[PDB]
Amino acid sequence: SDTSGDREVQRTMMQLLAELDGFDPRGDVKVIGATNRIDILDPAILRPG
Amino acid sequence: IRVVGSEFVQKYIGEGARLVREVFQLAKEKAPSIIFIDELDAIAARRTNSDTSGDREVQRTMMQLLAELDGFDPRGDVKVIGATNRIDILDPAILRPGRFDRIIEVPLPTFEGRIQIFKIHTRKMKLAEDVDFKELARITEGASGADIKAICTEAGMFAIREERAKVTMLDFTKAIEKVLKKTTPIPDLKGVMFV
Amino acid sequence: AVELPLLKPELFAEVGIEPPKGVLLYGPPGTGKTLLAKAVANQTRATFIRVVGSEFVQKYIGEGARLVREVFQLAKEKAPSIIFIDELDAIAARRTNSDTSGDREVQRTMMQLLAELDGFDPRGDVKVIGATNRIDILDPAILRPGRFDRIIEVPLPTFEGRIQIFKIHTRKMKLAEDVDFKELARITEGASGADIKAICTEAGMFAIREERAKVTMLDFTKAIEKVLKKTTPIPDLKGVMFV
Amino acid sequence: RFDRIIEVPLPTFEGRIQIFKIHTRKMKLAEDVDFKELARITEGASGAD
Amino acid sequence: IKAICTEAGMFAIREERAKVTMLDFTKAIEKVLKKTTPIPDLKGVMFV
Amino acid sequence: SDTSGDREVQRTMMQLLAELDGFDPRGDVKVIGATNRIDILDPAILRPG
Amino acid sequence: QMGYDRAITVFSPDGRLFQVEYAREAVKRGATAIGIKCKEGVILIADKRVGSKLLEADTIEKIYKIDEHICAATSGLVADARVLIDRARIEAQINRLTYDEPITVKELAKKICDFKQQYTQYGGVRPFGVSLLIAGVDEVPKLYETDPSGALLEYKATAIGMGRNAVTEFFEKEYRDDLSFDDAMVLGLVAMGLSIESELVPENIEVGYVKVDDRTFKEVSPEELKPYVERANERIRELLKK
Amino acid sequence: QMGYDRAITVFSPDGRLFQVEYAREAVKRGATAIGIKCKEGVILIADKRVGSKLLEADTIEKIYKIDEHICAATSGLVADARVLIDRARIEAQINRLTYDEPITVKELAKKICDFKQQYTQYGGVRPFGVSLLIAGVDEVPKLYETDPSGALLEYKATAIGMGRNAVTEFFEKEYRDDLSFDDAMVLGLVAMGLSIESELVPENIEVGYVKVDDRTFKEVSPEELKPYVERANERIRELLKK
Amino acid sequence: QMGYDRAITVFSPDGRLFQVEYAREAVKRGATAIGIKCKEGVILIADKRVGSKLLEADTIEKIYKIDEHICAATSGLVADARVLIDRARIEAQINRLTYDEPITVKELAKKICDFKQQYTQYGGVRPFGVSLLIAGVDEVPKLYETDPSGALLEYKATAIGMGRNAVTEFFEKEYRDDLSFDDAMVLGLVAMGLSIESELVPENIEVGYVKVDDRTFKEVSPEELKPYVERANERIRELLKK
Amino acid sequence: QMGYDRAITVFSPDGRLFQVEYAREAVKRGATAIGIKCKEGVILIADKRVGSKLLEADTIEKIYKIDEHICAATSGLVADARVLIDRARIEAQINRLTYDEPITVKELAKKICDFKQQYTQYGGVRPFGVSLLIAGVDEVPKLYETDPSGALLEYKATAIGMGRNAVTEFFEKEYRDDLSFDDAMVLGLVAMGLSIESELVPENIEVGYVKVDDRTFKEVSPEELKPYVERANERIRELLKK
Amino acid sequence: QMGYDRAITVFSPDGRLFQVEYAREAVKRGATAIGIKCKEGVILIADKRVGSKLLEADTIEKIYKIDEHICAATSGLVADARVLIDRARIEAQINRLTYDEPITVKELAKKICDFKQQYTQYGGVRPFGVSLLIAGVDEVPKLYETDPSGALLEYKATAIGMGRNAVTEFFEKEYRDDLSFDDAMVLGLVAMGLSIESELVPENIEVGYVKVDDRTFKEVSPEELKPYVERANERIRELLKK
Ligand SMILES: [Mg+2]
Secondary structure, three states: OOOOOOOHHHOOHHHHOOOOOOOOOOOOOOOOOOOOOOOOOOHHHHOOO | OEEEOOOOOOOOOOHHHHHHHHHHHHHHHOOOOOOEEEOOOOOOOOOOOOOOOHHHHHHHHHHHHHHHHHHOOOOOOOOOOEOOOOOOOOOHHHHOOOOOOOOOOOOOOOHHHHHHHHHHHHOOOOOOOOOOHHHHHHHHOOOOHHHHHHHHHHHHHHHHHHOOOOOOHHHHHHHHHHHHHHOOOOOOOOOOOOO | OOHHHHHOOOHHHHOOOOOOOOEEEEOOOOOOHHHHHHHHHHHHOOEEEEEOOOOOOOOOOOHHHHHHHHHHHHHHHOOOEEEEEOOOOOOOOOOOOOOOHHHHHHHHHHHHHHHHHHHOOOOOOEEEEEEOOOOOOOOOOOOOOOOOOEEEEOOOOOHHHHHHHHHHHHOOOOOOOOOOHHHHHHHOOOOOHHHHHHHHHHHHHHHHHOOOOOOOHHHHHHHHHHHOOOOOOOOOOOOOOOO | OOOOOOOOOOOOHHHHHHHHHHHHHHOOOOOOOOHHHHHHHOOOOOOOO | OHHHHHHHHHHHHHOOOOOOOHHHHHHHHHHHHHHOOOOOOOOOOOOO | OOOOHHHHHHHHHHHHHHHHHHOOOOOOOOOOOOOOOOOOOOOOOOOOO | OOOOOOOOOOOOOOOOOOOHHHHHHHHHHOOOEEEEEEEOEEEEEEEOOOOOOOEOOOOOOOOEEOOOOEEEEEEEOOOHHHHHHHHHHHHHHHHHHHHOOOOOHHHHHHHHHHHHHHHHHOOOEOOOOEEEEEEEEOOOEEEEEEOOOOOEEEEOEEEEOOOHHHHHHHHHHHOOOOOOHHHHHHHHHHHHHHHOOOOOOOOOEEEEEEEOOOOOOEEOOOOOOHHHHHHHHHHHHHHHOO | OOOOOOOOOOOOOOOOOHHHHHHHHHHHHOOOEEEEEEOOEEEEEEEOOOOOOOEEHHHOOOOEEOOOOEEEEEEOOHHHHHHHHHHHHHHHHHHHHHHOOOOOHHHHHHHHHHHHHHHHHEOOEOOOOOEEEEEEEOOOEEEEEEOOOOOEEEEOEEEEOOOHHHHHHHHHHOOOOOOOHHHHHHHHHHHHHHHOOOOOOHHHEEEEEEEOOOOOEEEEOHHHHHHHHHHHHHHHHHOOOO | OOOOOOOOOOOOOOOOOHHHHHHHHHHHHOOOEEEEEEOOEEEEEEEOOOOOOOOOOOOOOOEEEOOOOEEEEEEEOHHHHHHHHHHHHHHHHHHHHHOOOOOOHHHHHHHHHHHHHHHHHEOOOOOOOEEEEEEEEOOOEEEEEEOOOOOEEEEOEEEEOOOHHHHHHHHHHHOOOOOOHHHHHHHHHHHHHHHHOOOOOOOOEEEEEEEOOOOEEEEOOOOOOHHHHHHHHHHHHHHOOO | OOOOOOOOOOOOOOOOOHHHHHHOHHHHHOOOEEEEEOOOEEEEEEEOOOOOOOEOOOOOOOOEEOOOOEEEEEEEOHHHHHHHHHHHHHHHHHHHHHOOOOOOHHHHHHHHHHHHHHHHHEOOOOOOOEEEEEEEEOOOEEEEEEOOOOOEEEEOEEEEHHHHHHHHHHHHHHOOOOOOHHHHHHHHHHHHHHHOOOOOOOOOEEEEEEEOOOOOEEEEOHHHHHHHHHHHHHHHHHHOOO | OOOOOOOOOOOOOOOOOOOHHHHHHHHOOOOOEEEEEOOOEEEEEEEOOOOOOOEOOOOOOOOEEOOOOEEEEEEOOHHHHHHHHHHHHHHHHHHHHHHOOOOOHHHHHHHHHHHHHHHHHOOOEOOOOOEEEEEEEOOOEEEEEEOOOOOEEEOOEEEEOOOHHHHHHHHHHHOOOOOOHHHHHHHHHHHHHHHHOOOOOHHHEEEEEEEOOOOOEEEOOHHHHHHHHHHHHHHHHHHHOO
């Protein structure tokens, strides 16, 4: 809290958690996510469902 | 395309990302094109923390430019070309080749290397009538090419003070003493504290 | 250092001296480092731009960097040009060898100073004049020639010096002739040049307070007291226990 | 500002079992399964897991 | 306190009545305090 | 400038300063004012001109 | 800020230790003392003016017996002087035990210089913020100053405290090596006068001396000091006119 | 400052020991204690005031017997003071052991200065946060003040403690060098009535003394206290209307 | 504030010491212990409250024995008390060795408080953070409060602990120096009941007392606390209604 | 940063001891000393120029006889000199006490280094910031420098102190191993004169030597000194026309 | 990053001692010293060039006799090296004293490891900055290295100091388990010439050795050194051609 370089990127992250799979159905996504480490990623991307 | 890349990285967040996006994108338009990213030391991130706002802000800038470089978006006949002063401050993504296929060591100039830098610069001046570039090289080994330029620059200014307006061997050597004080001093006596 | 190169680039053929890329002012700040910078600017008919050092850095930086770029652009657009750079300690200072949080900011502003000084071609001439508190809070990475060719010790003004600055101001004053410039100087011991100036403004106030157009020696002595003299500077304390 | 503050915790033994049942139902026969054994293995694991 | 009273009334409902007896309250009070910002639970071995 | 905000304010800063300067090397219209803080902002009214 | 004076064990990068240069400043804040050498003995002259009249007029002391033939004066804290003077008196007297000869001015000074320097090296104890004057006639009249650093400096004439800088310049002009005993006591009584910017009354100065002929320490009685002080007043007043 | 005040070892670039000035403000935390010297005897007047009435005031006292003609008073930590003065009791007694002859008031002052000095010097230990007023008659009446470091100033009217500054002003004006022992007793109660800022009741004060003629310690019992306090009250009230 | 609370060797600029203040907050943190003095004895009461029932119903020991007629009670750090009273016990035995007479409570309190002050002096050793109320009858009854600061204060009635402040305000109104032995213990039971704000049972108090008429400490059983406890309980009830 | 410099135990990321490095610079602050070796003995030239005319020109001495046949110069603090030399004097004789034989020029210089090596390893202390030059002839002539660090380096001509830098450059061309005793003496004063960049006078410099036809320390009077200083002064003049 | 070179009582989060690693980088800030073991002897070469030509050839001169069959060379602080070397010499004679057994090469290195580990563990002192090559033939050839901390590692060729890395890389190519005395002596001279990037001359290194057939130390003589310079330099010229 009380930053803008690591606050603002967290309220668009909170949007994502929650759009990628959230409220909305299904469709045909199947979102291919790609990353270099899982050691500095949010635990919601890390988990399945 | 000459960019100083530390010059970016805005605190109005993602404006930072935009700027690198556009320069890359422009590279494909004006292809074939060389982009020079100077000091990847603040436009390249590190994933080990030191500023909570700072690491992530650079990171967004960093993975954006990587995206354009060969992330999914084609090289575009670029031809990076890119300079850095540190290597341990780098993310694994850039460190590897295939985003910079030939990693080059650029060391400090050799004995022969002093001579070459010396020649280019003394042609801009009034030379010497006592020229030896080997003699100068012995003291200056262990300096850098920018100190070689520095010495030259001091000699010409020295000549003004002397009221000669002519550069020679005697001014070149005086210029070595003065330059070497500031910024790469080399003989210093270690037989005092140590054996 | 600066002036004679800038107006005469015949020097870069007759001697063959490759352009100076910087000169650094040291000794006490506020003496009239700004004024020296203007004095030069007048002589080469250049564009003076003043950058305060509090314009550099915040606490994660962007706007600090943005303005180094801005004034580098104005100077190239407005060449010959002289960028006064007070006060080196918030954009050039010593580094940590083992990290800290605060330093990171300071470094990122810095790399951009270091780059641009070397960056100019004689296509656009950007000469700069630095100024600082001392050189012993400054890294040697900028005190390299071609980043700062030479240095000028600008100290405090000499006894005889204070007299010549007092004389600039006495001119303006109406009915001045009981002024001893030496005694006034004596009293204004360890005063900078700026201080001399402040006293003169205030001699005029003192005088109009006594409801006269004449500004001689009562007025000037009273002025000195207001601005300069408020100190005893090393006395204290006699014991009790230190006696 | 709510009154009814609900902590959603990790699943418990019985808690996992109710979920397996729904998914098996959609997913035809699987009668050689012991639902209790599946829960013992997946101890303290999330609903999305 | 507004929360304790609503929690208690919901207790009364659980027991299928509207009489809010002392026992509906006691259960309620423990539910609301269990959540909250901090109540005593440590007093040292070097102090009482 | 971040487009709408910055530019309006930039304009009103410059418009403020040029006038007050220009009618007073000396008393004619005397300008008085106040501020509660000035450490919070770029020099402008901290500029000694 | 520095931290090159956090301890006495941290040198400054310039190669100096700041903390003994501040113990040097401890002496200055205390009051003045002047030691004045002629070729017929030595004189020692010291502040006793201290504070208002609540304090006793003949308040004890700046002018200490070391021996009955070597005397000392101080400047700095008169705490660090008082225990140091206890240490001094023992030190001279140990010399007398083991040699049955009196300590020479030079040799007592050398031992105070070692003693001071003991405290200076350990971080666990601070050195005194006191300086000392050692005046005698062993058989050559001699005047020294022992520093808070525990350094030894030979002096023709010396001063310490508040008036240190005035007395120096003053003796740069007037002092000679061939001043009489009478002249050298009086000369330093003007200088002492200048040090406090006031006329010398005989109740705010304590003055002792070691003569060469006797080699015996004697203290100048208030009213025996009065005519020497009286001749000084003419020059001190004169000079306070400017 | 804000670092060169975090130890007893550091000096400042003004060459002050701020830890020692601070131990001295400790003195000023404590209640006023007042000494007068006159030529017929010396007087010690201690504040013996209690701040709640469930206190028993026999041990709120300052006055400690040391020798049979040396009494003393204290201001600072209560703790610091009792251990210090117990050292002084022993020291006075020791002096009688190796010489067979009561201790002089001066020597005791030098010894107890010197005890406090090792504790000022050694960094591993804090100084005693206390000053003494040492009052006795040895053959000729004496009044000393010791400072927290061990510095020595001989007085003639003095105080330490809260009321010190005001008692200093009072004796500037009132204290004369011809006051009889009787006369000076009342004057010293007028000085205590002033600093405490109301008139005094004998239960909140204690007087002890050493006279020259008797050359004994006595302690003034509340019966023998009253005629003096009664005189004193009259004038203590008058100075509260200035 | 900063840096004036991280060591024991530093004073504040006001002559206060914030480390030592925090040891006084240490006394205030723990359970109340009341001592009430009377003309027939001295009654020492300490709360034997337990914050659970798993805790023994006679918790060792809220009232310690030092000598045969001397006891003390604790508030603050209970850890420390074990150590501290071992010292007090050995000190009363040490005086029976070297003089064959028990220790007077006054001089005992001084010795214990001195041992505390010794642990204030050192920079690596922090002081005990505990106050003890030493009670005994030597000739007349005596009650002392010993503080973590090393300072002793004598009282007519006292309290320490978290109930300290309440019982000064209480006994100020209510205490008189004319209570009988029974009337004294009952008034002290009322004080304990006020502080904890519940009624007493013989299981949340430990009482001993000291008789002049026996010159000995005796320790009161729960059975014989019952009469005093009932009488007292009435006054407490009336105080917890207003 | 830079350092890691406020401890003596700490080696910094350079791998130097900053503490120790600051103290080699404290040598420089002390007055120059010039050492010169020839095959006919060893001459040591030492600056005894301090102060204006406040101080006496003879100021001890500064070229101390350490042993019978070994003498030493000091550069750095005089205070630092006193203590290192006290110990040095004792060590020279200590060898003679337990062997009844000459101390070696090598061996004395090592154990003068050792005393401070003790003060370089240990954490409770600083080394003295002083460099002594150790010159003598046990049986061949030798010149060493002892360093505040504790390094022992044999020189053949050298300088240390203020003149360190100056005299190395001078001796690159001038210093030869086929020089005469007389030539060496003169060349050493030119070196010193260059250090101060001024005209010499034979009254404020002291030259002593250990010859190989003597094997004893000797010292060259000021009446003798005059012709050597005078042939020096021509050569200072040639140098100060360039 | 760190701040765990600030202590030597600590470990860092990677479990390292960075203090010890900068005492390691004091060794690398000293001139090299090289050891070679052959199966005919063991040969230790160490730099003997230091400073300007105004310092004797024989200024350190590192390869000290420790015992009759053990020599040990150094790299690091010439100040700490001396004390260690002296301690190495004493430990070897203690072994002789208590056993009459000349100390094993291995067991001598072990006793040194333990000695330097007392100075690593204790925080009131620092670890040495010095690495020694302990070398000899006890009854087979041995070469060990004792580290700044005191870690024992056995080598068959090594170097320590600034020259270290190049000479390691060199051995990794050239060094053979079939090596002989003549080849070895040549080999280490070649190896020393890569470090200094320049030719060798005879006296600008010292070489000590222990043969199997003699089982006794002999120093290589300059004249004996001479034919080895000439053959070594052959390869040196070739490898300094770029
Ligand atoms: Mg660049």
